[PDB]
Write a protein that binds this ligand. Structure first.
Ligand SMILES: [Mg+2]
Ligand SMILES: [Mg+2]
Ligand SMILES: [Mg+2]
Ligand SMILES: [Mg+2]
Ligand SMILES: [Mg+2]
Ligand SMILES: [Mg+2]
Ligand SMILES: [Mg+2]
Ligand SMILES: [Mg+2]
Ligand SMILES: [Mg+2]
Ligand SMILES: [Mg+2]
Ligand SMILES: [Mg+2]
Ligand SMILES: [Mg+2]
Lengths: 345, 190, 138, 199
RNA sequence: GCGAAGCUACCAUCUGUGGGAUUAUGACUGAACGCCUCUAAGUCAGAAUCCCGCCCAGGCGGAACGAUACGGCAGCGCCGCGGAGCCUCGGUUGGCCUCGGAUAGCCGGUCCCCCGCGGGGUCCGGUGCGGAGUGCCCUUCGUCCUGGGAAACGGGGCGCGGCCGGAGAGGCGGCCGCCCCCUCGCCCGUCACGCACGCCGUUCGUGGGGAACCUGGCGCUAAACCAUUCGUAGACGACCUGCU
RNA sequence: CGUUCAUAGCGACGUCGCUUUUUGAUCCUUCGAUGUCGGCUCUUCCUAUCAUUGUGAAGCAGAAUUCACCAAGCGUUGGAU
RNA sequence: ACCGAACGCCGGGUUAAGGCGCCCGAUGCCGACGCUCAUCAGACCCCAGAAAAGGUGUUGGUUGAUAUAGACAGCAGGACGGUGGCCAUGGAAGUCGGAAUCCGCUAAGGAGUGUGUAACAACUCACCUGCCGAAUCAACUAGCCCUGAAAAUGGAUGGCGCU
């Protein structure tokens, strides 16, 4: 028979195999469409979730009851010390897909970055890109390099820069800096490539990518919660007190006669550490890091035009389970995916 | 059954010159060219006469629904010729019992904003098919003029503004409003 | 945009059938898809014959739609259709194709030897022509 | 030793039928420009027919169930797979000979490629009948790479037009060359038309 | 009582997107049926639909790049050219390409005009059951000798250096210098090659694919896993980290 | 019948069907046992569409509406006995 | 359980009933003549599926017309009087209904097809022309196709497919 009283089903199928994500660093599953017209730029950045807090602000949506009324608002601080471009990598369209075509790496590469390439650095002799960097100082290599760049100019369509974090400048334990491909979206590919060829080995700060009051999409891995029962993982009804074989369960898995249990039925498994791309998180504040002209400039963070004190976004006793945000940071509205310390695209 | 042969003729006028790359008539004259393809109609577009005076269209071994095309090709070339020579002029009068459908052309003919239809805040923007050019007429108060060579494109663009101005969830017998085609004439008569 | 027609008096080459490789005049059309046919000079008895098998030439000899065979025999021999047909490029490349089938093993060998050489001569003359064309371009 | 068949202008099942038997007799086949395969019956007709096939899925776990391939190459492969005993070893071996492509890629873009005239649309259909391009069909059912396949084929056709122009240029010189030489190839050229070429 | 951290609640807070094809429908041009008709050929608008997008997972599916075992015995990467010796087999000339049309096409040449030696046009001349034909083309299939003719500067030395074109899965060509050697296609003469005594898997792609073994030249100088550690992770594995 | 008007909506006397969410027939399967009602819980499908999108109809002026089409995407609740 | 055919163990031949795109032995015939396009096509005894009733969809028939005294549609001109005819008054002078139901003028108009009216009016529906230029039109009938035609895991002309 039909189910008596209707009700919408628990949880979304548009999110499943509810398994532990392969990646830790959240992948950008699609970069925006590079109109060829507007000038070149980076489309992505890689920050770190340091911590939450309030803001207060005058709101200006006329019509609302809250028009010209100071609301408070939660915010995430994503500590975002500048990335270093250490590569470019050309792609070409095919009917099969979007084949990577040619990867040109920079000359010098940090031990921050080189870390990444070994599973055990203590034990390695740290011999990566050693025979590579020989190319960057001779006639033969430099010529081949130029021909590679020329080929990319002829053939390639999509160009992504490879950059990596400055793990050095953080309060985190790890030294092994996260690399990431970031897509250069702008004018023609020859222009596009000579921009990234100029940026090679160079810093790139956050303000170069993003601007204030800009909607951006946070991409990361969710705060993981291990094995969890169906009542936690699917928010199924608890059964009542009298249930003999437990009550944080689903009673009827399925009907008899599709005589299999379906993929749509709720089962206990991994809850959390999923990959998730939350969109439309408005940047309230791109904050300037500590710097020195004579003494420290700690003010430039959490001081407002109306407050004028000498704060940084660091609270008393620091952000908990994190550190001091001594670098430039963004300040999104609301919560975002993942734990404290988590790398965040 | 299979009719052993059918045909017709299309007497082109001495002003116009028609030419056919196979089965793709191209008709040019006073106002401009008008190409049209008939690869999909399956006929013998012969062109005969010194001074190239008449277009003939055979159709061999046709069955009833195949012989139905013969005249419709012939007729489409007739309109094509008319378009080239005279050019089509569809006139459409606005009608209302209150809200005086405010029309205004924009880029040249292209756009047609149609404001205050039935007291609606929504402003209908209506493009025209490439070639057709709307223009708000004089000598008549609530009345548009769509001119153009390719009749198909004109009458489509007329419809575009006719269906734009449609009444939803009302008694359409009561609510007779919109910009309706009043007259399907020519740009010049001779 | 048709040039050849099932006209009375059209000569048609029969592509296949019992009378394959024979010319034949269309005396009268019986039907949508069947022609009453004759080839008096070409050894083909007066009979109905479907169009599917006949492919039609560029020769319309003129007689009346149901004459009695004698008269088409005259109109064939007046026009001298046998002479004219054998003169045609079509009939030549029929004659060719038959002579390629008749080819014996020694005859096949001779040919190979004759081509082996004849394509060598041309090949050089083409190469000379290319060099001359390159010299003009320079 | 290998068929390459330009799938353009052919009929989907009609070609697949012929390909299957070739493949079963050990003939290695390649089928190229599969988006250009065209299927009898008006477009809408066939879209629904595909969309139905999409609906077919193993209710309890779609991940197992009938994998609906979008690309025209894989579609055509699917229909040829339906005419072999593909559960057998010999059937599986047979398919391994067949090699299908959306568009025409680099080994075969400089190979002459055949046409099965028994599967051809101009022959097998009445001209007043309607049909569908398997491309359009593939596109609307979710094939990602129509436009890419078009942009790569415009290159190829431009690249080929050049080759043909040079080919023509040789042919022309060769026609000139014979005329330049036709008294010192005269008693060869005579013998090649007693045994019936050159006529 | 109060309560840090941590879990956690519409019991707190934040975010939830864009296209395409079209359906029903209403229309255009328009025959059938000298009119008329949304339809027959043709065209338009069109949706909580459907397909994709975004979003999640990621194939006995691919990718570019890095580093590639100095050694205390090592072991390998290329290159070229040699000897044996298991094993796995299929094969038994090649074809190096316009685009497409089908109630049409192919080739020329433009005298003439326009565009970037080509492209487009017109005009004219040829083909069209396609001979600038897959019913096709290319290639030859005994070895040598000498001694004439016609054809004659062509071929080679895994001959050697430079300049190109090729990215869709490039994997292949092309064109230019220099060294040495030869006289090869087509006819004829002129002899000779175990002529193994009528008789089967011959004849090639073949220096084939893989595994194990002897020579030269130039290169190389490891990561991974455990253990330990960490807690962004965790049932256990796994995962993220740290360690002259 | 619907003032008038067979057919907006209806529809007698007659007639042709589909359906297996009713109940009967029937007894083919299972009596070396297929756990016998309801409720809870959960998933999925169907459409014979209540609402929601797009539309044709009216005895649709508006409002309210019934009739029909595409259509099952999304919903369809809290209690008293 | 249908059709064919009834079995010692084997070679060659030939058949039946069934087939011969590919799965799969055989049409890879230059097979013959038609019919039919389906946004639910159809595709073989038993058998696994549809009816009444519809359709200028297309194809055949059958029967009757019509028209040069040049029609048929397509547009344009009139549709009256004897007459509030009679029954019915609740109003029907053509018009809710029903018995009637002819003459005149006639070129010709029914004591009226409808619209609509309390009832008229007003409008609308033959006979004939003007233009145009050969077939036109009606009623049946039976073939394919279509509507009729709604079920629950995703699905079955056996499958792939096929015009
Ligand atoms: Mg329900
Ligand atoms: Mg209990
Ligand atoms: Mg209303
Ligand atoms: Mg329609
Ligand atoms: Mg549209
Ligand atoms: Mg749309
Ligand atoms: Mg998908
Ligand atoms: Mg062998
Ligand atoms: Mg009544
Ligand atoms: Mg029962
Ligand atoms: Mg049980
Ligand atoms: Mg329904």
């Amino acid at each position: 028979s039909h189910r008596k009283f209707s009700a919408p089903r628990h949880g979304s199928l548009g999110f499943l195999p509810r398994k532990r994500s392969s990646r830790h660093r959240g992948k950008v599953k699609s970069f925006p469409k590079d109109d060829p017209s507007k000038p070149v730029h980076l489309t992505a950045f890689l920050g770190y979730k340091a911590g939450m807090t309030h803001i207060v602000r005058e709101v200006d949506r006329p019509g609302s009851k809250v028009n010209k009324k100071e609301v408070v608002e939660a915010v995430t601080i994503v500590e975002t010390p500048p990335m270093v471009v250490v590569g470019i990598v050309g792609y070409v369209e095919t009917p099969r897909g979007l084949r990577t075509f040619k990867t040109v790496f920079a000359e010098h590469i940090s031990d921050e970055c080189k870390r990444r390439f070994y599973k055990n650095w203590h034990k390695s002799k740290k011999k990566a890109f050693t025979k590579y960097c020989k190319k960057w100082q001779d006639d033969a290599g430099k010529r081949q390099l130029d021909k590679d760049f020329s080929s990319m100019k002829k053939y390639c369509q999509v160009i992504r820069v490879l950059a990596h974090t400055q793990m050095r400048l953080l309060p985190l334990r790890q030294k092994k800096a996260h690399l990431m491909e970031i897509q250069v979206n702008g004018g023609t590919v020859a222009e596009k490539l000579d921009w990234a060829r100029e940026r090679l080995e160079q810093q790139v700060p956050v303000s170069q990518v993003f601007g204030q009051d800009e909607m951006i999409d946070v991409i990361g891995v969710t705060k993981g919660k291990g094995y969890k029962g169906v009542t936690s993982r699917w928010h199924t009804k608890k059964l009542p007190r009298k249930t003999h074989r437990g009550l944080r369960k689903v009673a009827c898995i399925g009907a008899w006669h599709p005589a299999r249990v379906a993929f749509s039925v709720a089962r206990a498994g991994q809850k959390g550490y999923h990959h998730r791309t939350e969109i439309n998180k408005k940047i309230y504040k791109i904050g300037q890091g500590y710097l020195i002209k004579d003494g420290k400039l700690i003010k430039n963070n959490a001081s407002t035009d109306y407050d004028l004190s000498d704060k940084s976004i660091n609270p008393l006793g620091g952000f908990v389970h994190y550190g001091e945000v001594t670098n430039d940071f963004v300040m999104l509205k609301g919560c975002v995916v993942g734990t404290k310390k988590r790398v965040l695209t | 059954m299979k009719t052993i042969l059918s045909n017709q003729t299309v007497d082109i006028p001495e002003n116009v010159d028609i030419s056919l790359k196979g089965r793709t008539v191209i008709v040019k004259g006073p106002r401009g060219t008008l190409r049209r393809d008939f690869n999909h109609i399956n006929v013998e577009l012969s062109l005969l006469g010194k001074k190239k005076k008449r277009l003939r269209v055979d159709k061999w071994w046709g069955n009833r629904k195949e012989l139905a095309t013969v005249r419709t090709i012939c007729s489409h070339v007739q309109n094509m010729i008319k378009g080239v020579t005279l050019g089509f002029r569809y006139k459409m009068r606005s009608v209302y019992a209150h809200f005086p459908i405010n029309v205004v052309i924009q880029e040249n003919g292209s756009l047609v904003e149609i404001r205050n239809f039935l007291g609606e805040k929504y402003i209908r923007r209506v493009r025209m098919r490439p070639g057709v050019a709307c223009s708000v007429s004089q000598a008549q108060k609530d009345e548009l003029v769509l001119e153009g060579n390719d009749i198909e494109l004109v009458s489509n663009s007329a419809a575009l503004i006719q269906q734009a101005t449609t009444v939803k969830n009302k008694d359409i017998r009561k609510f007779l409003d919109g910009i309706y085609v009043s007259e399907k004439g020519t740009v010049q008569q001779a | 945009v048709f040039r050849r027609f099932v006209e009375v008096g059209r000569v048609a080459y029969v592509s296949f059938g019992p009378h394959a490789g024979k010319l034949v005049a269309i005396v009268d059309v019986i039907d949508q898809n069947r022609a009453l046919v004759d080839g008096p000079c070409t050894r083909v008895r007066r009979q109905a014959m479907p169009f599917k098998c006949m492919q039609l030439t560029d020769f319309i000899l003129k007689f009346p739609h149901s004459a009695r065979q004698k008269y088409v025999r005259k109109a064939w021999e007046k026009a001298d259709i046998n002479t004219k047909w054998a003169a045609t490029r079509w009939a030549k490349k029929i004659e060719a194709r038959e002579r390629k089938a008749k080819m014996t093993d020694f005859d096949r060998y001779k040919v190979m030897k004759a081509k082996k050489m004849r394509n060598r001569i041309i090949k050089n003359e083409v190469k000379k022509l290319q060099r001359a064309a390159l010299l003009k371009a320079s | 030793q290998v068929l390459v068949l330009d799938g353009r202008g052919h009929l989907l099942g009609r070609l697949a039928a012929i390909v299957a038997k070739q493949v079963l007799l050990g003939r290695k086949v390649v089928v190229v420009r599969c988006e250009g395969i065209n299927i009898s019956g008006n477009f809408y007709r066939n879209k629904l027919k595909y969309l139905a096939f999409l609906r077919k899925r193993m209710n309890t776990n779609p991940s197992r169930g009938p994998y609906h391939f979008r690309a025209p190459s894989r579609i055509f492969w699917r229909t040829v797979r339906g005419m072999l005993p593909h559960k057998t070893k010999r059937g599986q071996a047979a398919l391994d000979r067949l090699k299908v492509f959306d568009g025409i890629p680099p080994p075969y873009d400089k190979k002459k490629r055949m046409v099965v005239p028994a599967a051809l649309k101009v022959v097998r259909l009445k001209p007043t009948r309607k049909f569908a391009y398997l491309g359009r069909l593939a596109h609307e059912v979710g094939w990602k790479y129509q436009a890419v396949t078009a942009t790569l084929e415009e290159k190829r056709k431009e690249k080929a037009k050049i080759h043909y122009r040079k080919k023509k240029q040789l042919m022309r010189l060769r026609k000139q060359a014979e005329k330049n030489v036709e008294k010192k190839i005269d008693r060869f050229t005579e013998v090649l038309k007693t045994h019936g070429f050159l006529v």
